[PDB]
Design a binder for this molecule. Structure first.
Ligand SMILES: CC(=O)SCCNC(=O)CCNC(=O)[C@H](O)C(C)(C)COP(=O)(O)OP(=O)(O)OC[C@H]1O[C@@H](n2cnc3c(N)ncnc32)[C@H](O)[C@@H]1OP(=O)(O)O
Ligand SMILES: C[C@H]1O[C@@H](n2cnc3c(N)ncnc32)[C@H](O)[C@@H]1O
Ligand code: MET
Ligand code: SF4
Lengths: 800, 538
């Protein structure tokens, strides 16, 4: 009551396009961790929901690695590296963040990270050893004793680089050992005698770059698995050399051993390394390789011997050894060979090996589960998905059951909830991708429940409608009735869409009839889920920049980039027979946003020239004709209060005032636009006091709910991805104080990381009054930004 | 069904080939193909690509020198990959109101989703359209095709086509160049410099990049920007040496600007290739000969490469309207062949001709050239008239080996000096005099008094190109039946280092290079400074 309760409900995102950005924990009920833009996202595949975001990075995240315990409990600490020259050590408690420590001292983006716990009997506070490698031709080592960190050593590789790292301990002792793969096609081994790391051995054999190494402990011996761009996988073996005796079988042929000696407690110990095998079977590069983690069944630890590899030729291979002979054999080969789509970057196991996950070139995630009875059959499952570049616009269903987003990745996506009988929580998944275009998309607007308008980096607006199988799939997944969702008003219509032979368009296929009861996977979404094109509008001289629509569903606006006055002109269209209606020439720069008052008697525009204008519709009866618009108020340089570019504007729900937000860190209210009957000329002017939010404002939105206490709540977004809810109140007195009150603000884990481009409340006009609601305790809205992310937020009603 | 019969035929063919290799005898492929196709009852013959695409791995490695297809694709010593930019408008649309009077296609045209000066039906255009103009996908796709043919892709060179590339926003150019370098190397970088470092340490060498630009977009700023990218070649469209033609076609600049841009680019260290167009309006049959004679005799014009593009009239252009109104008429085919023969007889021995005509599909042309092999018809006519062509392309070992059947016997060393663009140019070469066969070449220039780069001021001589022809020899390998890795490069550099010290009088020598070449010159004894590889000569 005293404070509002803002909480997040759903997040949609996909991993970055980097090697080693995905990692699965070990132990029962582990968590998946990946990196999106500047955040580390934790994901729970069993519930298929995102639990939290960890954000303290200022650039792109590159590597993530959990820290493995010895008891078998789920891990609680991890280490991340960013393209901002810094490493971060996190701590987790109760699926939350407890503490984060920044490690600094690099001069380039970091690209490899590893860390282990130390074993010793002084009862320390869990001492940790960390190794990192970056783009400044150096490798750094760190130690973390409690809340204190210190840099033990740095290693310089001249003008080379290190591409992979791994840490472990020598067998039957407690001396840490390090393996580094380099661009020299050669692996380097370091051992920590005394207090520093010293080179002991160098392993040759590869003849291309190395893209992953991994240690493993088997009995009293140590194994090393190495992959490269040679399309080959090699396994080595490290063991303790004999006691300098009991060696008399000279009647055998054996490979020469690579030997080194170490000092331990005034004792000399000799170790030997020798190659084991050389696998093959891949065509393109091999991007990753991983052993199988150990796990506990009914107390006893089981230690399987298996290997996983993912390659650039759209394939994954699982390897196991043969006991009858001395060779390894392929067991399962999974993937989709064919098409212009490229291969995989990363692959991960489960706790016990039931599930396998892989990360694709664009950012798609693929998950496979093994059958219980049939042990050589795997089936794909449902995973999170989202844009792989900045989202630019957002809209709501007129009745509120799905959202549509566009982004600079040249795609359009639709998200809708899934209803299942044997559970209570509801989860939202992608079900439709009704565009794969050849230009960057910029704007979108909604015309009917299954029809929209899109505008991209070209001089043409396009109109898309929905095919038939989409309605059946929608009503099946969302749990509605097919007859009632049609409302006997759509009737006959095309069945699907397909890519044209030449050019960019959509063609009706009156693709394949495929009924669905569960959300699809990232192979049915890419092909069988397009929408036909039914219109194409010309009349602009440059690339589109803004689009809006009125509440009566019959009109449409547009704008384009311009540098003079003859190009920056608004254009009005029709929605029953698309022709230009009238041209509104004003302003000299680009129009950034427009808005229709809910009264359907106004249109407002804001522009880069720090000005604005209001256009009033004249009244005629003339039923066969169409009304017209003309200037009602305007603003020059002097009357303008915003000192810089205006980015957003919005209307009050009663068509009385309107709010503007600009880069001048100020949100202003201009009011008294009512009394349309007969004013002398106008009375439009500033009706409040300017507010200094703290940063540039790039989004403004007003809730479409009226309260008797006359509350006007405004959702303000900033460049830094903050979302602030204020509460504006008309003073009604000649002082303008006590009109700006701060209501609630987003937390550090609920916020974004880059600019916010849109905010839109759920204007459920179809449900004018909430029939089946808990007294409307909550209000929902949605947000998108340039951090590849789309979020849905919920706020308590009575608090505001 | 024919499919399994085809598969069995292919398998039998490789079986016979590998057997013959095992016991080590030579085998004729065509007879085996016909005989094996006879057995299984077919009505067609196997294709080379199918036979290549079914060899076991070790045998795939061993027996490619017998199943290679289209040996011309790597007969010059490198592998060429062509990529295209995003559609955009030419920069001079604003302050003139329109574009050149003969250029087809573009953002505002009836050729849908096509780049300026192209139609979209071309081979490279249809490759980037289905890839939606993404450099990574285009590079990967082209390298896959080249490997499927059976060629070696150790050494690569890019060609960036489209409109004016250097007129785009900086972010897009950053994106494009870093993606090209990443596609070659395999890294995932953030900006140009990181990508350049990793490509320097790569194993698939990037020899150089080529960019097409306008004379008004070739200044100190643009030259420095292209120097940071790794570019080493430039393509400029001169089209004419007459001042009235350059303004009646709404070109947008003047010839003097072209000459000044040539001077700056050559002093900076680039290589210059010029586009020229015969049969322009208001140019008869006698002004063309004078045009080209002045081109190759006047020091202000002498380029390093040429592209001959006879004028074509295409729908939707101003020249089309001129042609309909009965005011413009093309040459007769015999006259065109005669003119091309006469032009080709004038090219100096230090100039290379890359292409001889455009590649627009025949049905789209309203008038002009109609055949598709103008170069060989012109060569036959030249043989009839008694004159000979002596450019660089038609004198190198690979071309002389595939068109004729000759091999060098009495190699000698040749040097040619001249003056061009206000500078003293030298051209060193190794070639066979009696049979007129070229092997390797090097270009050297003494920097003039109007150089602006910091690294080249104070007495520096710059090397602009080093090249050895033949077939491609992979790095660190040797082939005694080819010409590359046999020591013709360190012989050409030792002589360049003697001219620059005893004759030019300089005290430093600089080289513009790619990245694999960076490692090569580091091997020779050069160090790195800025974007150049430099060495002290004192
Ligand atoms: C700098 C520029 O502008 S580009 C140079 C031209 N670009 C090309 O690669 C096309 C053809 N080029 C060539 O013929 C060669 O690469 C040249 C011109 C660089 C040298 O020509 P060659 O006569 O073959 O050189 P030469 O025989 O003296 O040297 C052979 C050695 O160079 C090495 N080498 C050749 N090219 C490269 C390269 N790109 N990077 C590293 N080493 C190289 C060979 O491996 C060999 O080394 P090794 O036998 O000791 O192991
Ligand atoms: C890409 C190159 O194509 C040439 N070019 C442009 N238009 C035509 C035409 N109609 N006919 C022939 N060549 C042409 C110009 O020389 C340009 O620089
Ligand atoms: C692709 S046309 C040639 C390059 C440039 N547009 C010029 O006219 O010089
Ligand atoms: S500058 Fe070149 S591409 Fe542009 S219109 Fe002229 S000829 Fe065509």
């Amino acid at each position: 009551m005293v404070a509002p309760v803002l909480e997040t409900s759903h997040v949609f995102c996909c991993p970055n396009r980097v090697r080693g950005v995905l990692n699965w924990s070990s132990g029962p009920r582990g968590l998946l961790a990946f990196g999106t833009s500047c955040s580390v996202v934790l994901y729970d595949p069993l519930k298929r929901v995102v639990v939290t975001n960890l954000n303290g990075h200022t650039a792109r995240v590159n590597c993530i690695q959990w820290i493995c315990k010895q008891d078998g409990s789920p891990s609680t600490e991890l280490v991340s590296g960013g393209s901002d020259n810094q490493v971060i050590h996190w701590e987790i408690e109760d699926n939350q963040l407890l503490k984060a420590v920044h490690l600094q001292g690099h001069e380039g983006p970091v690209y490899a990270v590893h860390a282990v716990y130390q074993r010793r009997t002084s009862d320390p506070a869990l001492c940790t050893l960390i190794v990192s490698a970056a783009a400044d031709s150096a490798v750094r080592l760190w130690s973390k004793k409690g809340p204190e960190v210190m840099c033990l050593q740095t290693l310089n590789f001249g003008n080379g680089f290190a591409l992979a790292l791994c840490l472990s301990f020598l067998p039957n002792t407690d001396v840490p050992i390090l393996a580094c793969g380099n661009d020299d096609c050669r692996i380097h081994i370091f051992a920590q005698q005394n207090d520093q790391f010293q080179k002991v051995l160098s392993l040759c054999g590869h003849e291309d770059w190395i893209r992953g190494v991994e240690w493993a402990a088997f009995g009293r011996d140590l194994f090393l698995a190495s992959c490269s761009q040679d399309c080959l996988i090699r396994i080595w073996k490290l063991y303790i050399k004999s006691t300098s005796l009991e060696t008399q079988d000279d009647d055998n042929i054996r490979l020469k051993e690579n030997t080194f000696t170490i000092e331990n407690e005034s004792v000399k110990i000799a170790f030997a390394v020798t190659l084991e095998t050389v696998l093959a079977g891949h065509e393109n590069w091999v991007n990753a390789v991983h052993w199988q983690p150990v796990f506990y069944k009914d107390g006893v630890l089981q230690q399987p011997v298996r290997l996983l590899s993912a390659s650039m030729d759209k394939t994954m291979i699982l390897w196991a050894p043969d006991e009858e002979s001395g060779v390894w054999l392929e067991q399962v080969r999974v993937g989709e060979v064919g098409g212009n789509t490229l291969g995989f970057y990363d692959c991960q196991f489960n706790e016990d090996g039931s599930m396998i996950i892989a990360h694709a070139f664009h950012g798609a995630l693929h998950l496979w589960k093994q059958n219980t009875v049939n042990p050589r059959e795997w089936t794909p499952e449902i995973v999170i998905s989202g844009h792989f570049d900045g989202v630019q616009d957002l809209v709501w269903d007129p009745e509120g059951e799905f959202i549509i987003t566009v982004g600079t990745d040249q795609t359009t996506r639709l998200f809708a909830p899934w209803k299942r009988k044997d559970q209570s929580q509801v989860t939202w998944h992608e079900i439709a991708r009704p565009q794969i275009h050849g230009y960057d998309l910029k704007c979108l607007a909604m015309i009917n429940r299954f029809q929209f308008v899109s505008g991209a980096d070209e001089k043409v607006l396009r109109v898309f409608s929905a095919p038939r199988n989409f309605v059946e799939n929608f009503c099946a997944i969302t749990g509605q009735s097919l007859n009632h969702v049609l409302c006997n008003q759509d009737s006959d219509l095309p069945e699907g869409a397909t890519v044209p032979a030449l050019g960019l368009s959509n063609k009706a296929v009156f693709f394949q009839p495929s009924i669905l009861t569960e959300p699809p996977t990232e192979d049915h979404l890419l092909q069988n889920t397009l929408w036909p094109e039914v219109q194409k509008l010309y009349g602009h001289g440059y690339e589109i920049f803004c689009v809006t629509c009125n509440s009566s569903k019959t009109l449409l606006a547009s704008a384009c980039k311009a540098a003079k006055k003859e190009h920056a002109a608004i254009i009005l269209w029709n929605t029953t027979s698309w022709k230009q209606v009238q041209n509104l020439v004003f302003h000299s720069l680009t129009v950034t946003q427009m808005a229709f008052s809910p009264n359907e008697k106004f249109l407002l525009a804001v522009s880069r020239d720090r000005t604005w204008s209001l256009w009033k519709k004249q009244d005629t009866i003339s039923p066969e004709f169409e009304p017209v618009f003309s200037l009602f108020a305007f603003t020059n340089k002097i009357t303008s209060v915003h000192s810089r570019i205006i980015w957003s504007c919005d209307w009050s729900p009663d068509s009385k005032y309107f709010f503007t937000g600009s880069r001048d860190k100020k949100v202003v209210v201009w009011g008294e636009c009512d009394s349309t009957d007969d004013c002398i000329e106008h009375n439009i002017g500033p009706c409040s006091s300017v507010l200094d939010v703290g940063g540039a404002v790039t989004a403004v939105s007003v809730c479409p709910v009226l309260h008797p206490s006359q509350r006007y709540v405004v959702a303000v977004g900033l460049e830094c991805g903050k979302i602030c809810l204020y509460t504006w109140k008309k003073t009604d007195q000649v002082p303008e104080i006590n009109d700006w009150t701060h209501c609630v603000e987003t937390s550090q884990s609920q916020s974004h990381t880059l600019a916010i481009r849109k905010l839109c409340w759920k204007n459920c006009s179809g449900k004018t009054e909430q029939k089946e609601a808990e007294g409307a305790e909550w209000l929902h809205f949605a947000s998108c930004g340039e951090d590849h992310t789309v979020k849905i937020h919920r706020v308590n009603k009575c608090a505001l | 069904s024919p499919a399994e019969l085809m598969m069995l035929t292919i398998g039998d063919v490789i079986k016979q080939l590998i057997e013959a290799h095992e016991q080590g005898k030579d085998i004729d492929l065509n007879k085996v193909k016909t005989k094996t196709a006879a057995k299984y009852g077919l009505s067609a013959q196997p294709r080379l690509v199918d036979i290549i695409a079914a060899v076991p791995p070790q045998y795939r490695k061993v027996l490619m020198p017998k199943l290679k297809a289209k040996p011309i694709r790597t007969a010059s010593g490198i592998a060429v990959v062509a990529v295209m930019c995003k559609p955009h408008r030419c920069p001079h649309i604003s302050f003139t109101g329109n574009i050149c009077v003969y250029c087809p296609g573009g953002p505002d045209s009836d050729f849908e989703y096509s780049t300026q000066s192209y139609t979209g039906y071309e081979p490279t255009s249809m490759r980037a359209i289905r890839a939606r103009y993404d450099p990574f996908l285009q590079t990967r796709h082209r390298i896959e095709q080249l490997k499927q043919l059976g060629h070696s892709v150790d050494k690569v060179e890019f060609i960036v086509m489209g409109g004016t590339f250097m007129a785009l926003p900086e972010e897009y150019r950053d994106y494009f160049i870093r993606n090209l370098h990443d596609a070659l190397s395999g890294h995932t970088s953030n900006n140009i410099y990181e990508a350049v470092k990793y490509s320097e340490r790569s194993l698939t060498k990037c020899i150089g990049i080529t960019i097409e630009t306008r004379p008004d977009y070739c200044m100190k700023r643009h030259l420095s920007d292209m120097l940071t990218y790794g570019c080493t070649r430039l393509e400029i469209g001169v089209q004419s040496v007459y001042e009235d033609v350059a303004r009646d076609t709404n070109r947008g600049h003047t010839v003097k600007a072209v000459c000044e841009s040539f001077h700056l680019a050559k002093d900076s260290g680039f290589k210059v290739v010029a586009h020229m167009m015969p049969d322009l309006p208001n140019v008869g049959l006698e002004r063309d000969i004078e045009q080209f004679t002045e081109f190759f005799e006047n020091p202000a014009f002498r380029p390093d490469g040429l592209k001959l593009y006879p004028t074509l009239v295409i729908r939707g252009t101003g020249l089309y309207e001129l042609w309909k109104s009965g005011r413009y008429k093309s040459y007769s085919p015999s006259d065109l062949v005669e003119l091309v023969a006469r032009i080709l007889a004038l090219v100096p021995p230090w100039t290379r001709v890359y292409r001889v005509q455009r590649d627009i599909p025949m049905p789209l042309v309203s008038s002009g050239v109609e055949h598709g092999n103008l170069r060989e018809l012109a060569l036959a006519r030249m043989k009839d008239l008694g004159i000979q062509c002596r450019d660089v392309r038609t004198r190198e070992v690979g071309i002389q080996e595939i068109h004729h059947k000759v091999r060098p016997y009495q190699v000698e060393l040749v040097r040619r000096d001249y003056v061009a663009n206000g500078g003293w140019e030298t051209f060193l070469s190794y070639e066979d005099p009696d049979q007129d066969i070229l092997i390797g070449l090097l270009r050297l220039r003494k920097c003039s008094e109007e150089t602006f780069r910091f690294e080249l001021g104070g007495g520096v001589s710059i090397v602009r190109e080093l090249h050895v022809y033949g077939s491609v020899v992979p790095v660190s390998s040797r082939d005694p039946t080819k010409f590359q890795h046999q020591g013709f490069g360190m012989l050409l550099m030792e002589e360049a280092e003697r001219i620059a010290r005893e004759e030019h009088g300089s005290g430093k020598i600089a080289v513009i290079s790619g990245v694999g070449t960076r490692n090569y010159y580091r091997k020779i004894g050069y160090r790195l400074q800025g974007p150049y590889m430099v060495k002290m000569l004192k």
